[PDB]
Every structure is written in C-alpha cells, then in structure tokens.
Amino acid sequence: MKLSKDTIAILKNFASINSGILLSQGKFIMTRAVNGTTYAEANISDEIDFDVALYDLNSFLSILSLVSDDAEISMHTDGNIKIADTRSTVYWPAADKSTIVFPNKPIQFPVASVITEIKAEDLQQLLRVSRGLQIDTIAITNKDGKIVINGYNKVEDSGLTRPKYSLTLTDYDGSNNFNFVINMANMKIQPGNYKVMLWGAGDKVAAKFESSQVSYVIAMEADSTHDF
Template identity: 45%
Template sequence: MKLSKATLEILANFAVINPSIYLRSGNVISTKSVNNVTYAEAQIEDTIDADIGIYAVNEFLSTLGLFGSDFEIIADPADQEIKIKNARAQVKYTTVDPSVITFPEKTINFPVADVQFELKEEDLKRIMAAARTLRLPEIVVTQTDGKIVVKVVNSEDPSTNSYALEVAEYEGDNDFEFFVRVENMKMIDNTYKVLITKLGAIKFESEKVSYIVALERNSHFE
C-alpha cells in the first residue's frame, strides 16, 4: 500500500480534528472530533488495503517522513502492526484496536439545506485571518440586503471588534444567523459549497473532502 502526498496532507488535516484515526479498506477516509462537533470525510486517490487503527496520526506521519517519498506500507491486522519499508530500511509500527479511539461508525447523510452558497478559498482565508487577528471566537452566517454575509464576532460581547464580508447573493427572504465556533473550523484551504440546515449543522463540501460542523445553540432561522 502506498500513500500519495495528497492523502498525507488530508491525514495531517484530519489529525487536527482528532489525533487518532481508523482507516478502513477502500478509497474513503473519515474522522470526527472527540466531542462529536466536527465530522470530516475525503475521497482519496489511493486504496487502503486493510482496516488500520492509528492512535497518534502525527507520529505516524513523522515516521513515514523518515522514508521520504519512497516507502511501502504492509498491513498485518492480525498482529496489530504494519511494516513501513523501502529498499534499505524498515519500521515495525504498532496499530491499535478501534475500541480505544474515537471514529465515525458510519457516513453522515446531510439533510436538505435551508441556505447554500459558494465560499471561495480567498474569502475563507480572509475570514480565518480576521478571526486570528481580532481574536474573535465565533463565525456567523447571516443575510443583509440580499447578500450572504459572513461575520466574525463575539456574541457574548457585542461591543467588541467584529468583521464582516459579503460572500454571495441571497435570493430568499428568511432571516437567519448561524453561529460556528472558530475553533471548530479546521478545513483545508479550498473553495467550498456551503450547505446549512436549520436542524443544527453546516457542511463545507468540495470535490474530494467535506466537513460537517455542529452549529451553536444561539443559531436561528426564521
């Protein structure tokens, strides 16, 4: 089994959501946060040829880094270990039983969206930069005068700094505010189709990777 650079980048991103991962046989990898707030799924170009539990993803990736780009992974689920090797070197790496890590039991089927729009990569970068610069904890999606507006705010202290960015047109007449914690926004920089349901979740969807994040309780849709 080989893992491409693109797959390794996705695994590194998923490690920010959950330090452990359960890799299932096939071409899809997924993870979820320990507190069940964030779910992520990716279609990869490689094929996972065995079910493998990795307790410390960053350590696993650093181990692969010892081999550069020239390595092969041989799984032995019965012995709870994998071998990472090239022509000259080999590492025996211990895997774990899935019972000791948090992982998605099944794929999440997202409901029909009440609001949807495209969020361009450069706009996502601006929003996250504003959150860091102004040290604000929440992102809120709302509409003003026919525009989808993404704000970075502190809802517990409206008098503090805030940031607002128009990101798309809105043709509906609903009033809404959908709040997401900045700390749960752990996506790879990309352009995403954003889908939001009043049932309490927001989805960031791209061609190969998607994320679902729980909305905060102060969200509303009228």
Template identity: 30%
Template sequence: MQISNETIAILKNFSTINSNIIFRPGNNIKTMSTAKNVFASATVAETFPREVAIYDLNSLLALLTLNDKCEVEFHEESLKISKNGGDFEYFYSDPRLVTAPPADKSIEVDNHFQFKLTADDVQTMQKAIAITASPNIFVTSKLNQVTLSIHDKKNAKANSYKKVIGPGFDDFNVFIGVDVFKIIPDAYTVTVSKKKFLHFKHETKPIEYWLACDPESTV
C-alpha cells in the same frame, strides 16, 4: 503501497480534528472530533486493505513524511514502513481506545441556503480569525441580505470581519466556534442546514466537512 502527498495533506488536516483515526477497507477516510461537533470525509487514491486503528495519527504522519515514497505494508498487527533498506514497525491501537465515526456514518444535507467560498475567501477567514481573535463565525440572513462575519457577539467594540455573500430570503442566524473551523483552505460550496450545521463540500475534490452550529443558532 505508497501514500500520496495529497492523502498525507488530508490526513494532516484530519489530525487537527482528531488525533485518533480508523482506516477501514476501501478508499474512504472519515474522522470525527472528540466533541462530535465536526465530521469529515474524504475519498483518496489509495485502497486500504484492512481495518486499522491509530491512536496518534501525528506520530504515524511523522514516520510517513521522514522520506519521500515510503513503502507501507498492512500486516495483521502492525504497519511496516520501509525506506532505503530500513523498516519501521508501527503497531495498531485497540479500536476501543479510539474515537472515530461509525463505518456507515453519513449526514443528510438539506439545502436551506447555499453559497460558495473561494480559496482566497477561506484563507482570508483564517487570517481574520487570527487577527481579530474572535470566537465565532456567523452566517446571517437579514433584510434580504446574507453576510458572513467573524466577531464576538458579546462585545460590539471588538475587532471583526464581515463580507456580503449575496441576496437572502428567510431570516436566519447560524454560527460556529472558530475552534471547529478546521478545513483545508480551498474553494467550497457551503450549505446552511435547518438541522443547525454547516456543510462544506470541496469544489474539485471528494472532501466534505460537517460543522455543528451553536445551539443558540436560529434557522
């Protein structure tokens, strides 16, 4: 089996959420942060033949990206990664040492409020986080207007970013820590849930993220 560049990109993103991962039989990959406040799922081109626990995903990615088009074989206790006549043997981890979501984990999404973000929007948000050093991302509905903002609620004079998303209805104010905003910069449909999480669904690829909101959020 060869692992596509697109799947490698997804795995690199998932490694920022959690360096642990379990590949299960099939073509769906899931990950969950150790704090259990980020859950992500992606359907990929490859079909994995068996369950494999990986403790350090970054070290595996380093092997997979040493050369283009490495051949990967899934054996009982290890991966065999071959290129140019040479073989790496990469042993699986004990699943008990790995933090990963259950195989059947899914989160139902209620469409309390929904909006779209372009790839430029997401990239601007990521730059705004770096420039302002703000701790939180807010989605706020007030006076029939919904805004997306990045700021420090404890410091009114701190640097900030704000964008009007569109008209709103019920008032709400949900926010997440910037540390959980670990999505691939692309276009998404975003849903605000009454269960206090933000759901990011990729516009063109089968990739989804569920980001837990701060308990002080109101919706």
C-alpha cells in the same frame, strides 16, 4: 498499500480534528472530533488494503517523510504496521479501536436549506484575521440581499451585537431569515474553495463545507435563529 503526498496531506488535516483515526479497506476516509462538533470525509486516490486503527495519526504521517516515497505499508506478522523501505523496515503500533474515537458510518447531510459559497482566499483571510481580532464565534445571516459573515468575540459580546469583522459572501433573495452561529474553534477547514450548505430544522442546525477534495460537517451553536 502506499500513500501519496495528497492523501497524506488530507489525513494531516484530519489529524488536527482528531489525533487518531481508523482506516478501513477502500478509497474513502473519515474522522470526527472527540467532542463531536466536527466531521470530515474525503475520497483518496490511494487504495487501502487492510483495516487498522492509528492512535497518533500525526506522528505516523511524519514517519513517512523519513522513508521512500513508494515505500510499502502493510500488516506485519505481529499485528502491527510494517513500512517496507529500500534497505530498511519501520514498524508502527496498530492501536486497539477502544482507545480512539471514530464514526461507525459516514454522515448523510440533509438537503440544503440555503446554499452559498466562500473562495479559498476569503476563507484564508477570515481565519488569519480572526485569530487577530480575538474572534471565537461567527454568524452567517441574510442582509441587504446578501449572505454575510460577522465575526464576534463571544467573551465580551456574548449577545453577538458588536461585530469586529464582516465578510460579504453571495447574493440572496430568499424569503427566509437566519443567523447561524458557528464556533470558530470548529473551523478546522484546509484551504480551498468550498460550497457552503446551511441547514435548519427546529433546534437542529448544521453546516457543511464541500470542496473537490474534502467535505466537513459542522454542528452550529444554539444561539442560531432561522425561519426554515
């Protein structure tokens, strides 16, 4: 097989949610954090022609920039990975599935309770500015016919009543009410415009960010409140 920059890019994001990953034959990839708060799945143009599990995904991708762009990746005679180059050969360890955490099946996000969106430029600012204002958690709530995000520093505002940052998303008229809390540490979303789908069902609250390239499913904190 081969892996274009695009593919490599997403896997590099994936590498930040989970240091390892299991590649399965197909043109679909997925990964999930070790604590299970974040899941990501994407359809790549490149076709995977063999099943292999990688322990250090980020270090592996790096090794690729040191070789040909068309370089051929395959399963070697000894069971490891062989990266065939013009005048050279690079080998990489195929990991034993037990040393990594991966999904057995992809996630089926239930139908959206509420649907909103965030543009590549607002997400960027929200991430840059959060690190600045000591923000570690956020709340997506309805307010004045709109869906807004409030940044909070749970450290000193564990009740989340003193927002340090506020971003207005989309208009809203629905008859429901809600304050969905998301742990900022789980927001490992690569840049871009995402369709946000929030879902509540009793004590079960989950968020899904979708773009034309990737999709992330994220579990929301218990502080969450909704009348769905």
